[PDB]
C-alpha cells in the first residue's frame, strides 16, 4: 500500500503538470497530501526489521515532512487561483520525490 501511495503522489504530479485551471491543481495536491501522510506511517521493504527510531526510519518519514510542507505552499497558491505559480511549486516537489522515492 506504501507502493500505491508513491504512485498516487507520482500520478497527481502528472495531472498538475497538464492542468488547465486551479480546480484540477487543487484536487491533485489535496490527494497528494493524504497519500504522503499515509506513506509516512508505513515501513519500506529494506527497513522492515529496523528500529522505529533508526536514522534511516526518521529520514524516510522526514522525506514526507518535506513533501507535505511543499504541498502546503502549492495548495496556498492553488487556493488563490494561481495555476502557473502552483505548477512551478509542484516542480520543486519532483526534486523531493526523486531524492526519496527509491532511497529505501
Amino acid at each position: 500500500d506504501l507502493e500505491d501511495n508513491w504512485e498516487t503522489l507520482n500520478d497527481n504530479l502528472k495531472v498538475i503538470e497538464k492542468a488547465d485551471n486551479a480546480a484540477q491543481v487543487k484536487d491533485a495536491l489535496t490527494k497528494m497530501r493524504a497519500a504522503a501522510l499515509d506513506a509516512q506511517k508505513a515501513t519500506p521493504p529494506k527497513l522492515e526489521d529496523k528500529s522505529p527510531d533508526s536514522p534511516e526510519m526518521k529520514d524516510f518519514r522526514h522525506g514526507f515532512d518535506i513533501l507535505v510542507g511543499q504541498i502546503d505552499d502549492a495548495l496556498k497558491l492553488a487556493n488563490e487561483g494561481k495555476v502557473k505559480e502552483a505548477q512551478a511549486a509542484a516542480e520543486q516537489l519532483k526534486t523531493t520525490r526523486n531524492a526519496y522515492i527509491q532511497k529505501y
Partner: antibody
Amino acid sequence: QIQLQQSGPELVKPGASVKISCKASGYTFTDFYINWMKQRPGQGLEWIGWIFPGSGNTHYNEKFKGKATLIVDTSSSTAFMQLNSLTSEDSAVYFCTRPVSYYYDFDYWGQGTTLTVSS
Amino acid sequence: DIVLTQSPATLSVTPGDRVSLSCRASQSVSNYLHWYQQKSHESPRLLIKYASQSISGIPSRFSGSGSGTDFTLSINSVETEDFGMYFCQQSNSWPLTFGAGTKLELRR
C-alpha cells in the same frame, strides 16, 4: 522590472555572524521559491537551501544546515540569509536566485554579495 | 549527492569554429540539467534549461542535447563574447549540485 537586489559587500571577523538581504520587486514575493548559492572566485557554485517566502518553509543542503539560517520579512519583500560562526572558508560571493522553471521564460539572480571573513 | 563532471576543464577554440562542452552526472538526472555562462564573478546567465530547451533571447549558435547522465552544450560558431566559464546544474534531487566548470579560451 523583476529584480533581486542584495546588500553591499561585508567585512566580518572570525567567529562573528552576518545577515545578507535579498530585496524582490516587480512580482509577488510570497509566491516563488528563493534559492541561496555560494561561489569562491572561478569555482563551481554550491546550493545552500531554499525558502518559500509565503510560509517561511525552508530546506537545506546537509553541508550548510549548521552554517546558514534562511528567513523572510514578507512586508518588505526581502529574503535574508544568516551566516554564523564565520571563518575564512565562508569568504565567498553569495547569490539569491529564483530557480529555472518549465512554466517561466527566465530564472532571476541577485547581483551577488561578496563576504570577506578576516581579522 | 549527485556529482557533475565537466570535461575538459579548459577548451581552446578560434572564433568561427564548432565546440562541444561535456557534462556527465554520476547518476541519472533525466533532463533536469541546466547550462550557465559566467564571464567573471557576475551572476550566472541561463543558456539552456531541461537539457535541450533554449532560453528566450539566447542566440541560435547555442544548443544543448542529452538525457540521463551524458549532456553536451554546443556552440555552432564561437564568438569572442563566448569566452568565459560554463557550468551545468542538476535539479533532479536535493542537494542541487553544479559542475566545477569548463573555461572556453582563445586558442594560439
